[PDB]
Design an enzyme around this catalytic site. Structure first.
Site, PDB file in Angstrom:
ATOM      1  N   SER A  13       0.786  -1.220   0.000  1.00 58.67           N
ATOM      2  CA  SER A  13       0.000   0.000   0.000  1.00 58.67           C
ATOM      3  C   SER A  13       0.819   1.271   0.000  1.00 58.67           C
ATOM      4  O   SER A  13       0.543   2.179  -0.765  1.00 58.67           O
ATOM      5  CB  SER A  13      -1.034   0.013   1.112  1.00 58.67           C
ATOM      6  OG  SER A  13      -1.864  -1.116   0.972  1.00 58.67           O
ATOM      7  N   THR A  40       0.503  -6.653   1.933  1.00 57.11           N
ATOM      8  CA  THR A  40      -0.362  -7.141   3.017  1.00 57.11           C
ATOM      9  C   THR A  40      -1.850  -6.906   2.837  1.00 57.11           C
ATOM     10  O   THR A  40      -2.641  -7.833   3.018  1.00 57.11           O
ATOM     11  CB  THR A  40       0.201  -6.801   4.426  1.00 57.11           C
ATOM     12  OG1 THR A  40       1.444  -7.448   4.566  1.00 57.11           O
ATOM     13  CG2 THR A  40      -0.756  -7.210   5.570  1.00 57.11           C
ATOM     14  N   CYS A  41      -2.253  -5.687   2.541  1.00 61.75           N
ATOM     15  CA  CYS A  41      -3.699  -5.353   2.436  1.00 61.75           C
ATOM     16  C   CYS A  41      -4.476  -6.313   1.504  1.00 61.75           C
ATOM     17  O   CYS A  41      -5.483  -6.900   1.843  1.00 61.75           O
ATOM     18  CB  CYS A  41      -3.760  -3.908   1.950  1.00 61.75           C
ATOM     19  SG  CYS A  41      -5.437  -3.450   1.599  1.00 61.75           S
ATOM     20  N   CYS A  46      -6.222  -6.732   5.139  1.00 62.70           N
ATOM     21  CA  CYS A  46      -7.481  -6.017   4.983  1.00 62.70           C
ATOM     22  C   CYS A  46      -8.517  -6.733   4.154  1.00 62.70           C
ATOM     23  O   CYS A  46      -9.620  -6.997   4.610  1.00 62.70           O
ATOM     24  CB  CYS A  46      -7.293  -4.586   4.400  1.00 62.70           C
ATOM     25  SG  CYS A  46      -5.854  -3.791   5.195  1.00 62.70           S
ATOM     26  N   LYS A  49      -9.528 -10.506   5.078  1.00 56.84           N
ATOM     27  CA  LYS A  49     -10.130 -10.413   6.395  1.00 56.84           C
ATOM     28  C   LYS A  49     -11.593  -9.926   6.310  1.00 56.84           C
ATOM     29  O   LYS A  49     -12.479 -10.533   6.889  1.00 56.84           O
ATOM     30  CB  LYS A  49      -9.286  -9.534   7.352  1.00 56.84           C
ATOM     31  CG  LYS A  49      -9.884  -9.321   8.741  1.00 56.84           C
ATOM     32  CD  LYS A  49     -10.913  -8.158   8.849  1.00 56.84           C
ATOM     33  CE  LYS A  49     -10.372  -6.741   8.542  1.00 56.84           C
ATOM     34  NZ  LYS A  49      -9.411  -6.211   9.525  1.00 56.84           N
ATOM     35  N   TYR A  97      -3.931  -4.125  -9.751  1.00 53.52           N
ATOM     36  CA  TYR A  97      -2.775  -3.364  -9.253  1.00 53.52           C
ATOM     37  C   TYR A  97      -1.659  -3.306 -10.266  1.00 53.52           C
ATOM     38  O   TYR A  97      -0.935  -2.304 -10.368  1.00 53.52           O
ATOM     39  CB  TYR A  97      -2.240  -3.964  -7.966  1.00 53.52           C
ATOM     40  CG  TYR A  97      -3.071  -3.457  -6.837  1.00 53.52           C
ATOM     41  CD1 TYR A  97      -4.292  -4.057  -6.549  1.00 53.52           C
ATOM     42  CD2 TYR A  97      -2.623  -2.380  -6.083  1.00 53.52           C
ATOM     43  CE1 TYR A  97      -5.057  -3.612  -5.475  1.00 53.52           C
ATOM     44  CE2 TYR A  97      -3.362  -1.938  -4.985  1.00 53.52           C
ATOM     45  CZ  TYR A  97      -4.598  -2.531  -4.726  1.00 53.52           C
ATOM     46  OH  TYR A  97      -5.351  -2.029  -3.705  1.00 53.52           O
ATOM     47  N   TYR A 180      -6.079  -6.207  18.119  1.00 50.57           N
ATOM     48  CA  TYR A 180      -7.170  -6.274  17.150  1.00 50.57           C
ATOM     49  C   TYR A 180      -7.218  -7.507  16.271  1.00 50.57           C
ATOM     50  O   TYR A 180      -8.287  -8.037  15.969  1.00 50.57           O
ATOM     51  CB  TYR A 180      -7.391  -4.955  16.373  1.00 50.57           C
ATOM     52  CG  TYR A 180      -6.570  -4.867  15.098  1.00 50.57           C
ATOM     53  CD1 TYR A 180      -5.223  -4.521  15.158  1.00 50.57           C
ATOM     54  CD2 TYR A 180      -7.125  -5.175  13.854  1.00 50.57           C
ATOM     55  CE1 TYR A 180      -4.465  -4.389  14.004  1.00 50.57           C
ATOM     56  CE2 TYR A 180      -6.351  -5.120  12.701  1.00 50.57           C
ATOM     57  CZ  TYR A 180      -5.032  -4.695  12.773  1.00 50.57           C
ATOM     58  OH  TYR A 180      -4.253  -4.598  11.618  1.00 50.57           O
ATOM     59  N   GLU A 184     -10.172 -10.048  16.005  1.00 50.75           N
ATOM     60  CA  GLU A 184     -10.880 -10.260  14.747  1.00 50.75           C
ATOM     61  C   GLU A 184     -10.902 -11.734  14.375  1.00 50.75           C
ATOM     62  O   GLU A 184     -11.938 -12.264  13.972  1.00 50.75           O
ATOM     63  CB  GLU A 184     -10.350  -9.380  13.571  1.00 50.75           C
ATOM     64  CG  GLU A 184     -10.652  -7.885  13.729  1.00 50.75           C
ATOM     65  CD  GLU A 184     -10.151  -7.027  12.598  1.00 50.75           C
ATOM     66  OE1 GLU A 184      -9.342  -7.660  11.814  1.00 50.75           O
ATOM     67  OE2 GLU A 184     -10.322  -5.822  12.569  1.00 50.75           O
ATOM     68  N   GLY A 273       1.927 -10.135  17.725  1.00 49.42           N
ATOM     69  CA  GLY A 273       2.559  -8.914  17.255  1.00 49.42           C
ATOM     70  C   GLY A 273       3.072  -9.023  15.816  1.00 49.42           C
ATOM     71  O   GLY A 273       2.856 -10.025  15.124  1.00 49.42           O
ATOM     72  N   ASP A 314       4.230   0.116   7.670  1.00 48.15           N
ATOM     73  CA  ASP A 314       4.429  -0.791   8.784  1.00 48.15           C
ATOM     74  C   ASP A 314       5.888  -0.892   9.187  1.00 48.15           C
ATOM     75  O   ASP A 314       6.191  -1.199  10.323  1.00 48.15           O
ATOM     76  CB  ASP A 314       3.887  -2.188   8.488  1.00 48.15           C
ATOM     77  CG  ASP A 314       2.402  -2.405   8.545  1.00 48.15           C
ATOM     78  OD1 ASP A 314       1.660  -1.291   8.637  1.00 48.15           O
ATOM     79  OD2 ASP A 314       1.926  -3.497   8.573  1.00 48.15           O
ATOM     80  N   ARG A 330       1.752   9.280  -0.058  1.00 41.97           N
ATOM     81  CA  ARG A 330       1.283  10.337  -0.941  1.00 41.97           C
ATOM     82  C   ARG A 330       1.834  11.686  -0.551  1.00 41.97           C
ATOM     83  O   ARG A 330       2.210  12.470  -1.400  1.00 41.97           O
ATOM     84  CB  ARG A 330      -0.237  10.435  -1.046  1.00 41.97           C
ATOM     85  CG  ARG A 330      -0.792   9.342  -1.949  1.00 41.97           C
ATOM     86  CD  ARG A 330      -2.307   9.346  -1.968  1.00 41.97           C
ATOM     87  NE  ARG A 330      -2.860   8.283  -2.810  1.00 41.97           N
ATOM     88  CZ  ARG A 330      -4.117   7.824  -2.732  1.00 41.97           C
ATOM     89  NH1 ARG A 330      -4.944   8.272  -1.780  1.00 41.97           N
ATOM     90  NH2 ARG A 330      -4.546   6.898  -3.566  1.00 41.97           N
ATOM     91  N   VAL A 353     -11.133   1.203  12.782  1.00 44.85           N
ATOM     92  CA  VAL A 353     -12.330   0.352  12.954  1.00 44.85           C
ATOM     93  C   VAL A 353     -11.793  -1.038  13.229  1.00 44.85           C
ATOM     94  O   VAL A 353     -10.850  -1.484  12.540  1.00 44.85           O
ATOM     95  CB  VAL A 353     -13.258   0.321  11.746  1.00 44.85           C
ATOM     96  CG1 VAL A 353     -14.164  -0.902  11.866  1.00 44.85           C
ATOM     97  CG2 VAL A 353     -14.067   1.602  11.677  1.00 44.85           C
ATOM     98  N   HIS A 450     -33.246   9.947  11.897  1.00 44.11           N
ATOM     99  CA  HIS A 450     -34.059   8.982  12.617  1.00 44.11           C
ATOM    100  C   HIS A 450     -34.785   8.037  11.662  1.00 44.11           C
ATOM    101  O   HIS A 450     -35.264   8.434  10.619  1.00 44.11           O
ATOM    102  CB  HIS A 450     -35.046   9.811  13.401  1.00 44.11           C
ATOM    103  CG  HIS A 450     -35.840   9.017  14.363  1.00 44.11           C
ATOM    104  ND1 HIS A 450     -35.242   8.384  15.424  1.00 44.11           N
ATOM    105  CD2 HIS A 450     -37.155   8.727  14.348  1.00 44.11           C
ATOM    106  CE1 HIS A 450     -36.204   7.762  16.065  1.00 44.11           C
ATOM    107  NE2 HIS A 450     -37.371   7.910  15.425  1.00 44.11           N
ATOM    108  N   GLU A 455     -27.540   8.670  15.175  1.00 45.11           N
ATOM    109  CA  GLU A 455     -28.167   9.850  15.759  1.00 45.11           C
ATOM    110  C   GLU A 455     -27.880   9.971  17.244  1.00 45.11           C
ATOM    111  O   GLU A 455     -27.962  11.056  17.759  1.00 45.11           O
ATOM    112  CB  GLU A 455     -29.683   9.925  15.524  1.00 45.11           C
ATOM    113  CG  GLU A 455     -30.530   8.853  16.215  1.00 45.11           C
ATOM    114  CD  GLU A 455     -31.990   9.118  16.020  1.00 45.11           C
ATOM    115  OE1 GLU A 455     -32.469  10.225  16.130  1.00 45.11           O
ATOM    116  OE2 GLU A 455     -32.678   8.067  15.675  1.00 45.11           O
TER     117      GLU A 455
END
Ligand SMILES: Cc1cc2nc3c(=O)[nH]c(=O)nc-3n(C[C@H](O)[C@H](O)[C@H](O)COP(=O)(O)OP(=O)(O)OC[C@H]3O[C@@H](n4cnc5c(N)ncnc54)[C@H](O)[C@@H]3O)c2cc1C
Ligand SMILES: Cc1cc2nc3c(=O)[nH]c(=O)nc-3n(C[C@H](O)[C@H](O)[C@H](O)COP(=O)(O)OP(=O)(O)OC[C@H]3O[C@@H](n4cnc5c(N)ncnc54)[C@H](O)[C@@H]3O)c2cc1C
Lengths: 461, 461
Positions: A13, A40-41, A46, A49, A97, A180, A184, A273, A314, A330, A353, A450, A455
């Protein structure tokens, strides 16, 4: 010695994003990649997963089918079906890619790069030499595994990499780690029917998140059928007649240590890790600084200690997320090829997330962090806890928790933490608001949508 | 004549919100309600609709079960099961609302209110008189139905109210109207298995939304199995031996009109508009101004033309949403009882979510509106269209479309429009950003959350 404007080591990435933006700016760039593009992604992170997550999410919704007026759904998840579709999708990405690189006129150098002894920073790939006035190291990292010296039989366990190679759903699985990725994987395996245990060294998972999240997340796991083995660690692993047998020590404080054997384990997954991939780069030939874990040290602009050598993603060991590697790559291309000297990534307020069940979204300071930064007297939090309307008609229940951390009199929003259905898609726009320095009045002055869970964040009192 | 500080006519969202905030401020308030507390949102609107939506959403996900590695789910949705659970939930809410009033010390006057001839504004409910220096009219509205004089047999059709009374899933259903309620009902009935037609007077639904949305929404409906009858209208309805028979005229421009009979219709649902509930209020006794549809005219502060008489919510006929009635009711209580004279609701940048399949989220100006407000030369839009990663493995597909409308050189974000999975929970925080006057750079400078759909909005180019 082929010369370029920009040489990028690592086609993941960060590497790709940086190479592509540089090419748009006129740079003549080449990307060295020893394995598959997308890194990796695409390959083991990512993408695969998220597909497995969407699949686990299907499993949970199917539990609610009868509640919703439908006839019970009967059975057995078929791992190979989804596995095959997932692999295919990953193949589609790799081809895309590759095509993106070509359309950008970026040269792809296939092979494993290493720095040379040469004075001016030069790399060698497959006997050929390459050089550039700007070289980016973006080699990512790998899953960490225990040494047989410390935990005998550790090599009988797999890592997140190995998870993506599984061809059948393991009957009995034990995941070791509390971060995480551990969370996950335990969530996916459990939702899909594996009898799952999660082994953590303390009492809660995600101990670096806001305490409302680590607490709620630990509870949700237990509620979902995951056995959380607290204060536990692996002492040794052995190959029995039918599976593995895991010897663990449980040392609850205020108690005597107890040793337990976990038998008939099909899958032992280490999620302890990640280690940086710098070991085979011959960094020392240039005297490029690393920390003691092998991370490349950089400044705020991604500079290493050597002129014309940068590092992103990373490998740097900070904020290990795909979007961060991209953004830093970038910003670096704009600084180098567009002469924007102030061009750099702000590492504060990066949203995350966690794809648990329900998902977790977080941005900014935890309550303790704000307390240390502004002082207890200057920190005010607001929080809510409710059962989403989706479960008004289900026997199965999940909760939604939200916490807002405000600072000073103005009540600047310095942190948002939540767990709940829909939280994965809800975070982005609040992350925009938090980045712009919104206060609680800004939230309070936005009309609610709503009926939604989102909300709740604009009606906290 | 019992005197209060504040008398609220209508115990729905606007009425309740206003009464509750006023009570917190010390006011002695009473709420007059002729039916059920909670009004439209609880009883026949927001709540029961969302439950039916969650149910339709189950139906669609169940189509993807086999794709995801599970065994096919076989069958028949049972309407009565969910209906019974939905009614119960509504009963739970009514009891909660009642309790909220009591804890606030708000008096509930049960019955139908009407203004009196009396000089000082006074109402009568069941022969007793009530008065207050501040009276709020918040009587909401109702579904509009055609006159038998214009469409004979119109009374054989039902409205959204009648939809919430259905006890079985209608076999064949025809929905008339092109607004959100029409769109939502068609989507629920179709997902649940009714053979559904949606009859619209033009070529697209949601014609007041940004054109990308009306176009995409019309297509998604067709893709989902809804028959959209364009340029069509009902000429008459009749009760046949087995169902209704709908006579319609189809008048495509550039074509000759054609008349078609739709037979064996089980449910004819009029979703043509809402009328204000002001007819029986005896407004004229005070000479309170209304428009020609019966809407109460108010100023920016919710004042009517008569001193000490205000109106909020659907009765006013502007921005007919539950959160708007609440916010306007609340702002009005602060102005009246906290003496905040500048206290009023900003009707710009109110976000809306339409619970279609996939859901729609919108906030701010459509492209045409920005073009009229700033000039073509000053409007720039960015948009994307993609297939969410959820469908990477499904035969069934839906799209996600997003459009950002920017104005001036700074590229202020003046409108966001999207349709797609997760869009219902995604809108809130961007609505906060748009309210605060974010520009495209503010979005672009927020790190993306991967992998999500929401991240598309922060990476538009
Ligand atoms: C299981 C898992 C799940 C994750 N889920 C998410 C998620 O949902 N969201 C998220 O934001 N992040 C997630 N992450 C983290 C995210 O994937 C990483 O932060 C991101 O991929 C790091 O990108 P990078 O460019 O630094 O490295 P990589 O993408 O690892 O790229 C390094 C590349 O360099 C190549 N390479 C290495 N050394 C050399 C050399 N000497 N010569 C040539 N090529 C070389 C490697 O083959 C590789 O392709 C996840 C990670 C994992 C492991
Ligand atoms: C099918 C449907 C779905 C909807 N979905 C949504 C949604 O998802 N999201 C959203 O934001 N909005 C939605 N809406 C719109 C939203 O429900 C309304 O804007 C909101 O309920 C209006 O609130 P109000 O307080 O003005 O009126 P109401 O809630 O209608 O309150 C009026 C009340 O006054 C009582 N009353 C009337 N006259 C008198 C009198 N003379 N004396 C005593 N009492 C009287 C009535 O019984 C009623 O209880 C939906 C509406 C419908 C019909």
């Amino acid at each position: 010695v082929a010369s370029y404007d920009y040489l990028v080591i690592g086609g993941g990435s960060g590497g790709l994003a940086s190479a592509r933006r540089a090419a748009e700016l006129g740079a003549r760039a080449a990307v060295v990649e020893s394995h598959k593009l997308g890194g990796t992604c695409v390959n083991v992170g990512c993408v695969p997963k998220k597909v497995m997550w969407n699949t686990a999410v299907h499993s949970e919704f199917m539990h609610d089918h009868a509640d919703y007026g439908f006839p019970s759904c009967e059975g057995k998840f078929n791992w190979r079906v989804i596995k095959e579709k997932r692999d295919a999708y990953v193949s589609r990405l790799n081809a895309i890619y590759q095509n993106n690189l070509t359309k950008s006129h970026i040269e792809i150098i296939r092979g494993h790069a290493a720095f040379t002894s040469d004075p001016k920073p030069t790399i060698e790939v497959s006997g050929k030499k390459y050089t550039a006035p700007h070289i980016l190291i973006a080699t990512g990292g790998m899953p960490s595994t225990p040494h047989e010296s410390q935990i005998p039989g550790a090599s009988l366990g797999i890592t997140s990499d190995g998870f993506f190679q599984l061809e059948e759903l393991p009957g009995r699985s034990v995941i070791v780690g509390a971060g995480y990725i551990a969370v996950e994987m335990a969530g996916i395996l459990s939702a899909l029917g594996s009898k799952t245990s999660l082994m953590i060294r303390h009492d809660k998972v995600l101990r670096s998140f806001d305490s409302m999240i680590s607490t709620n997340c630990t509870e949700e796991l237990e509620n979902a059928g995951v056995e959380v083995l607290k204060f536990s660690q692996v002492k040794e692993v052995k190959k029995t007649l039918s599976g593995l047998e895991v010897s663990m020590v449980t040392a609850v404080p205020g108690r005597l240590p107890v040793m337990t054997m976990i038998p008939d384990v099909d899958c032992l997954l280490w999620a302890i890790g990640r280690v940086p991939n710098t070991k085979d780069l011959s960094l020392n030939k240039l005297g490029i600084q690393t920390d003691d874990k092998g991370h490349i040290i950089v400044d705020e602009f991604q500079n290493t200690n050597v002129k014309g050598i940068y590092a992103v993603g990373d490998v740097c060991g900070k904020a290990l997320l795909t979007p961060v590697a991209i953004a830093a790559g970038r910003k670096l291309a704009h600084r180098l090829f567009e002469y924007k000297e102030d061009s750099k990534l702000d590492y504060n307020n990066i949203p995350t997330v966690v794809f648990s069940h329900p998902p977790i979204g977080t941005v900014g300071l935890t309550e303790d962090e704000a307390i240390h930064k502004y002082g207890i007297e200057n920190v005010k939090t607001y929080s809510t806890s409710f059962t989403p309307m989706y479960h008004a008609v289900t026997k199965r229940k999940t909760k939604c928790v939200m916490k807002m951390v405000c600072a000073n009199k103005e009540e600047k929003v310095v942190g948002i933490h939540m767990q709940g259905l829909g939280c994965d898609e809800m975070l982005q726009g609040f992350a925009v608001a938090v980045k712009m320095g919104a206060t609680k009045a800004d939230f309070d002055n936005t009309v609610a949508i709503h009926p939604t869970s989102s909300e709740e964040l604009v009606t906290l009192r």
